[PDB]
Amino acid sequence: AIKCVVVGDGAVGKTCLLISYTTNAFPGEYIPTVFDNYSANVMVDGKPVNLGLWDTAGQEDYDRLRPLSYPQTDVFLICFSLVSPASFENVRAKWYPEVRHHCPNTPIILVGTKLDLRDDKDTIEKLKEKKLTPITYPQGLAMAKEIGAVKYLECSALTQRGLKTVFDEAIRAVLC
Amino acid sequence: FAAARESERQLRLRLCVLNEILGTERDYVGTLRFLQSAFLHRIRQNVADSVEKGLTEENVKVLFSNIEDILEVHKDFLAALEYCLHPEPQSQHELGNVFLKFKDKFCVYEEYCSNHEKALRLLVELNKIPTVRAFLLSCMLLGGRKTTDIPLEGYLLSPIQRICKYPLLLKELAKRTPGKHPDHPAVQSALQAMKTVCSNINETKRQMEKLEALEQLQSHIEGWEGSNLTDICTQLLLQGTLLKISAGNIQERAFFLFDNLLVYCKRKSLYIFRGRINTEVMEVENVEDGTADYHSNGYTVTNGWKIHNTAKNKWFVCMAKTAEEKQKWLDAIIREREQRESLK
């Protein structure tokens, strides 16, 4: 079973992303808080793989507890919300160096979440209230190259847009 | 009446959160009971087969730690939850107080998480032994789980994750609890409390890691004299390269201040042992800038102080390059004393 660990700031929507992916439908009105360690049967490139997904929601503020999830990881998804520049910055400041410290050889995919909101008018105006703007694709590709990520991928847990490709690319980044 | 829809939405969601807290508590207790049943009960029912396959009692002890104490606590916690949410979860129910009641019982996690690093690393070694991997997998199978599922490592990881889940569940529950709602202050209290529980686990593991650093430091020092660092100390407070002036020979030496101890070494195993002072049989006299007396070999002392090893009648001088490095060291030693004196 491939080990895919999801790392990133709270309010990236890690739990939401994983739930939406694994259950094939955005949960809707209520987004669950808990995602148990999951093992799915995924079909990638005509071959069946066994994808084990591990969520880290809650451990974001507890630095000595986090590393316990890292041993034996096959691929990390470092996540940031495309409508939260802070969480983007923390790709550089907090998550990449930590993941690289405990796992220097394990592949890293930079995943931008909440794609559905990057051009959502209300969100953009609200961001502009605090002199901020959503992360654009080139910015994120730059970030991905900087930390030497195997890939940069955007997606939306709501619309499922580009969601399948994230975990397919994880599986592909492990097998090869 | 649009607000009539909004308040009802808040409660609809609050109910969702309560149901999640309860259901996932049930799942978690279920998991703990699996770990107990498939492994521990099985190993105890036949301890001889366990041993003759490769699992010593020390191994099981390090592997599963105090998972059963955690289980006990969650049987009680869950019972309390079910009682609080009777006959089913409903919006007006108040869960804050339950958490608050158990805020102190959760300390059992501190032992467990601190141990987990040691556990999984050991597990990596145990999976190298063929018959032991065989055994652990058999335990997984008889427990109703498969080999194409999450491996044992994840179940062993699950409590860390779970204890870290409560502040989230409570933040969301608080988000769905109106100001006038009776549960409100108790929920916010529960949030702060569980956050403190988690932080406490974190710090416990941190300061236990400092010990690993004491052992590793002692290993890197050649020709160690006296008792072990992990025997008499808890953490390194300060290290740096200073100028040491004995009676008749001057060299630069690397200093290490621990709680209860002061060590100095010769930089090259990165270091070579040169000396140790117990800090209560130590005295610090200040030297004023431009002083040149017997101990300093008649050298001009600036940014310097005298260290009296009273247990050996020995004085010597320490000098730091910059004016501030001095203050850093002096306050470090004053800190060490105040804390050691306070501990009594």
Side-chain angles (χ1 to χ4, degrees), chain B residues 10 16 38 74 82 117 184 189 225 270 283 293 312 331:
Chain B
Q10 285 298 113
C16 287
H74 280 266
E82 305 252 43
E117 186 167 311
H184 187 66
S189 275
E225 293 175 13
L270 282 153
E283 281 177 319
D293 56 308
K312 279 196 189 310
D331 291 346

Side-chain angles (χ1 to χ4, degrees), chain A residues 29-30 33 37 63-64, chain B residues 12 20 161 202 206 209:
Chain A
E29 189 190 39
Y30 177 67
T33 310
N37 295 333
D63 64 311
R64 295 325 302 159
Chain B
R12 210 184 318 152
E20 174 149 42
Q161 307 197 294
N202 194 52
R206 163 133 62 231
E209 278 172 351

Side-chain angles (χ1 to χ4, degrees), chain A residues 92-152:
Chain A
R92 191 185 281 125
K94 173 167 153 164
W95 298 118
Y96 169 58
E98 170 170 304
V99 170
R100 203 91 284 182
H101 180 272
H102 297 88
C103 298
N105 296 318
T106 306
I108 290 174
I109 291 168
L110 186 60
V111 177
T113 55
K114 310 213 160 94
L115 171 50
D116 58 82
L117 289 168
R118 183 207 274 144
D119 62 12
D120 164 64
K121 293 195 175 196
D122 299 318
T123 295
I124 284 168
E125 292 306 305
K126 188 75 173 319
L127 273 174
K128 284 186 59 154
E129 276 187 347
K130 334 276 294 188
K131 291 313 208 177
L132 286 173
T133 64
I135 278 68
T136 67
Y137 187 85
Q139 288 179 18
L141 185 44
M143 190 73 262
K145 277 169 189 176
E146 186 185 322
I147 66 185
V150 172
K151 208 129 228 219
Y152 172 59

